[PDB]
Write a protein that binds this ligand. Sequence first.
Ligand SMILES: O=C1N=C[C@H]2[C@@H]1[C@H](c1cccc(Cl)c1F)[C@]1(C(=O)Nc3cc(Cl)ccc31)N2CC1CC1
Length: 94
Amino acid sequence: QIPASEQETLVRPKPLLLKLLKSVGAQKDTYTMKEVLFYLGQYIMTKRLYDEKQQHIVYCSNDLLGDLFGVPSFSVKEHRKIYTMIYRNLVVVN
Ligand SMILES: O=C1N=C[C@H]2[C@@H]1[C@H](c1cccc(Cl)c1F)[C@]1(C(=O)Nc3cc(Cl)ccc31)N2CC1CC1
């Protein structure tokens, strides 16, 4: 469905994404998509936004992540949707 190559994509986060990334990882100008997915996953888990028991839904209406993605919640199974929400918060570099 999603190619493995997607995770090699180099990105420059927009300010609000960068702000979220900085609460879980070291700041730098450019990230891989692998890094962005890892750091956002860690952001979600540390802050207990993920309800794994009960439908694999992340609940983010009470959090900055909700502002980033424009949704009150989403399913962690919907990978293409997740990539699209992340993409709108960054600029791809070559
Ligand atoms: O399938 C999954 N089930 C749980 C994992 C993983 C999911 C995931 C992994 C690769 C690519 C995509 Cl698009 C993907 F969604 C991920 C992840 O590893 N990083 C991340 C980041 C955001 Cl913003 C949302 C969900 C996840 N989840 C973290 C759990 C704390 C919710």
